[PDB]
């Protein structure tokens, strides 16, 4: 994570290509008088922000002595990108990886993890995500070499974003951020960037996005929602709510609509949470007080992983 000069040097390992991602102004889709900057975490080597979390878990836990290659087994319950990033980096680094998820998950999700050699344990469909969480806990309780990646609570998650994501944004925006907006999954991205910005003296407003259908930060009841990657249904220990100026709820259908408009308007091809974050950014950018101001948000994951999902189902009947 020391600045590594990629367009100009040869990496020794693919994990040196994580982070240091581009930033892009929203153009055609931005009809307001505010500037909207997209931090393109879809451009990480395995196509989402969770590459930063994966690397921070392996790198930091190894350096602390908690992970020992060839011996420690990394376990996590994930039907999304954290599983992918843990399976990718564990393969390279000599760790067995076990990811649990319900048996009703798509072939694409299971297949991507098995390509990197992870053990996928499929738990009964009727038990949902809770059954997969329970299985990962059982494995870690039973086996002294098994450790939970612990994405919603690990101290490594907000830290990596404070050390890398946030300072990158600060350099790219020429030390000028009026608002940082990001959907909260584990909360690492919002927490770590908000810390970095505040230490640099930025008065940026920090805005958390969550699904209208699972408005847990706002004070409402958890529930099922469409916006894959955010809205865990609880407040993760990683998230530092004291840093947040506003929780903005975005409806799953606004996220979906925005994702499809973004591909055609700006050529940005992302998942449901990138459409939620941009829908939120455009809402804030409409506020008259934000004229001539810089709003930065995140495109968390590249769109190709969503072809099989609901997200682009409309394209069929168009």
């Amino acid at each position: 994570a020391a600045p590594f000069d990629k367009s100009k040097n040869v990496a020794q390992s693919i994990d040196q290509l994580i982070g240091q991602t581009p930033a892009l102004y929203l153009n055609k889709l931005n009809n307001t008088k505010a500037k909207v900057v997209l931090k393109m975490e879809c451009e990480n080597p395995m196509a989402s922000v969770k590459d930063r979390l994966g690397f921070a878990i392996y790198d930091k836990a190894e350096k602390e002595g908690k992970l020992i290659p060839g011996k420690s087994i990394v376990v996590e319950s994930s039907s999304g990108n954290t599983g992918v990033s843990l399976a990718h980096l564990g393969a390279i680094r000599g760790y067995k990886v076990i990811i649990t998820m319900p048996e009703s998950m798509s072939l694409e999700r299971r297949c991507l993890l098995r390509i990197f050699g992870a053990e996928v344990i499929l738990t009964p469909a009727a038990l949902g995500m809770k059954g997969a969480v329970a299985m990962a806990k059982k494995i870690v309780a039973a086996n002294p070499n098994a450790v939970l990646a612990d994405q919603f609570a690990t101290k490594y998650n907000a830290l990596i974003h404070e050390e890398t994501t946030g300072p990158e944004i600060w350099e790219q925006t020429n030390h000028n951020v009026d608002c940082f907006i990001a959907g909260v999954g584990t909360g690492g991205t919002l927490t770590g960037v908000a810390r970095a910005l505040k230490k640099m003296g930025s008065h940026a407003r920090i805005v958390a996005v969550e699904p209208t259908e699972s408005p847990v930060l706002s004070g409402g009841k958890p529930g099922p929602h469409k916006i894959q990657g955010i809205g865990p249904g609880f407040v993760p220990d990683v998230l530092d709510r004291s840093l947040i100026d506003e929780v903005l709820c975005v409806a799953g259908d606004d996220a979906i609509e925005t994702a499809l408009k973004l591909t055609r308007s700006d050529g940005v091809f992302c998942g449901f949470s990138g459409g939620a974050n941009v829908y939120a950014a455009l809402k804030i950018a409409e506020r008259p007080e934000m004229e001539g101001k810089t709003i930065v948000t995140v495109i968390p994951s590249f769109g190709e992983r969503y072809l099989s999902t609901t997200l682009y189902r409309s394209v069929r009947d168009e």
Binding site: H225, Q228, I230, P232
Partner: peptide, 5 residues
């Protein structure tokens, strides 16, 4: 969702 994360 799923956990989706």
């Amino acid at each position: 969702d799923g956990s989706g994360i």
